[PDB]
Amino acid sequence: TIGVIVPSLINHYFAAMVTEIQSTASKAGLATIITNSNEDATTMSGSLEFLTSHGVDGIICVPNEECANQLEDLQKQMPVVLVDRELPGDTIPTATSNPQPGIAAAVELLAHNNALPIGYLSGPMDTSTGRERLEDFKAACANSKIGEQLVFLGGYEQSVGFEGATKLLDQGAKTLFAGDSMMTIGVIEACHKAGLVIGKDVSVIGFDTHPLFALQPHPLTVIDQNVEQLAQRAVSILTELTTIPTALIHRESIINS
Template identity: 50%
Template structure:
């Protein structure tokens, strides 16, 4: 009796990663080259296609067909639902999506990489048509993998180094430069800064802009409190900066602004008289203070709308810019007056300078 032939060995299908490794390029470049993306050079396309043929790579037609089906939903992840800025961002995205007849599934990641990871997986399981995510840097690989699987994705508020996923964020330079210049012109020589976390692009960028602006105003080496985007951090940081003798404070986000107000009120300091305070984001509550707050305004509604517009472009097959930065604006009110020794010397407020070109400063001094 003839021996039975050996069982057939199952050959594992080649993946996009196999093609990328052989071609010597990234997985995202491989995906774009095979998809005919106009940004990929002809030489790279030829190299990738040759590698794909060599490893017998075939795109998963079933998966592509499934991706082509639309569900009429998009996903949105934000790091905090109690942060007024992110609540406003979510509202702007949801309203823009609604006008496009799309429903929005919202997730709160709690500034936690594991929570964001679970949210991204759930959104993919629900086969949303696209995702807008406020990213965590520890989720870089997962976000890139999500995009490489064909899910249109946009990063809102923050950028991620080492990726070409489109992002929409604010440019702190116009508002921050104007804020430091304004305080220096008022006579402040010790300006404290409440910095955000350095594991976010916004925290790093805003701090670097503040330090550069202080140096440009001939006030280098200003005191900085390294905190986080939480009210408690703004409270603790303000106490520390006040103990160091600053006459003015700039907060690096809206929650730290709230904490700064809490600390000033607890010490019975009159904001705008005993201490100058410039907040971040134009929260309506900031205008209701005894001295309405001067703020660096990111225009969160525009940022949310623009994020959705970039996602729409991706969903329709267009190639939007990789980085979109919207300028910030300084809105001057009563909280950023001169230091006590200057205000005691004169009861006449300083003249209001002209609005700077590009809308860097707007003056809204109250009448009371």
């Protein structure tokens, strides 16, 4: 029996991750209790306290930064592993995806297609995830020599991405490049509401693998993070108690200009 804590379950990515963490754990003879923090430090605080109180062998977890302290203490006693998100400072084994290879290829591809300017739709800047990927998109643009692009600093709600993406399209974006599952939804909602055919009137780059992204009238080019391998690796590290690269799935949502 192990414990897993995740910020959201309506996020298909985090529900994929726990399905795969659970399946790998059972193959190594271990059960799985899941918790959901709603991106709320107090809630996760509540969970960790509870999980270790009840004799779980290990914890695989997506750290809120506002929990850095309690998370260190449990190490000082509890086998802990962090996944997807990184603690901003000081030892706890972490397995995360490296976003640079996918982001660089998506930018490269936008550049060859003259599908510019790009409206990149950021995620919460309070996550290692949100900043890692915005650094990488910025460097890729320089490295691809297309110059500075449009950036919206999003957050958590589908509403935030819808509002973000609609503003990028106002500012002239010809490509919407989401940096999250949830931002990717806001981009779709935005193209739908504005009357635009993706892969025809505007280009989209999505983030993560949702089954329904592959089945749009023009399937979505997306950045895959390979959830299965991260979950495999993360449970390997929990039993014995690192980065998985990221990839571009080329589909049909980029116009050639």
